[PDB]
Amino acid sequence: ESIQSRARTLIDKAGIDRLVRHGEISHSRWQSVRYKDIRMSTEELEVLQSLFPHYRLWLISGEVMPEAGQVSPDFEEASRNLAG
Amino acid sequence: ESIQSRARTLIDKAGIDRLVRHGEISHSRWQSVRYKDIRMSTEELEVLQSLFPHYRLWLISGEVMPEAGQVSPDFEEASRNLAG
């Protein structure tokens, strides 16, 4: 729905511990942007896009392009469900 | 090179007047994120990515995928120059 909401989905998917281990941003800052009604900055996106390169197009725009390796959590879940 | 710096490049490309007409963000807020040493939020990125869809992957990551339609201002300039 928004870049912010997609970013929050990825915070949950990674878990904040993994983000703290893979960037310079603190647990308290991650917790604040995840759960408090505050803006999320490009600094948080830096960590998320580096950790999830196959989610880059979706994170910034909500679009996917599977042929180019650009997918999303929901696309991957739908694929697994249809496979089952 | 950061998301913030690429975003500022696109602020200059569009011009703040045009950005104000294409989103809910104020002229003053655009001037602040462009010219003050403050963080830029995903709310500004919303306007930039919607206005520059061909620059989405580059905005979030610095990477291009020209075969997938994902380029950058500098890549287009290099293409213009090489074409000559």
Author numbering:
A (entry chain A), B (entry chain B): 2 to 85
The authors write:
Pf4 exists as a prophage in PAO1 and encodes a homologue of the P2 phage repressor C and was recently named Pf4r. X-ray crystal structure analysis shows that Pf4r forms symmetric homo-dimers homologous to the E.coli bacteriophage P2 RepC protein. Li et al. demonstrated that repressor C, which they named Pf4r, was responsible for immunity to Pf4 infection and also regulated replication of the Pf4 phage by repressing the expression of xisF4. Central to these effects of the Pf4 phage in P. aeruginosa is the repressor protein, Pf4r, which not only controls immunity to infection and phage replication but also acts to regulate the expression of host genes.
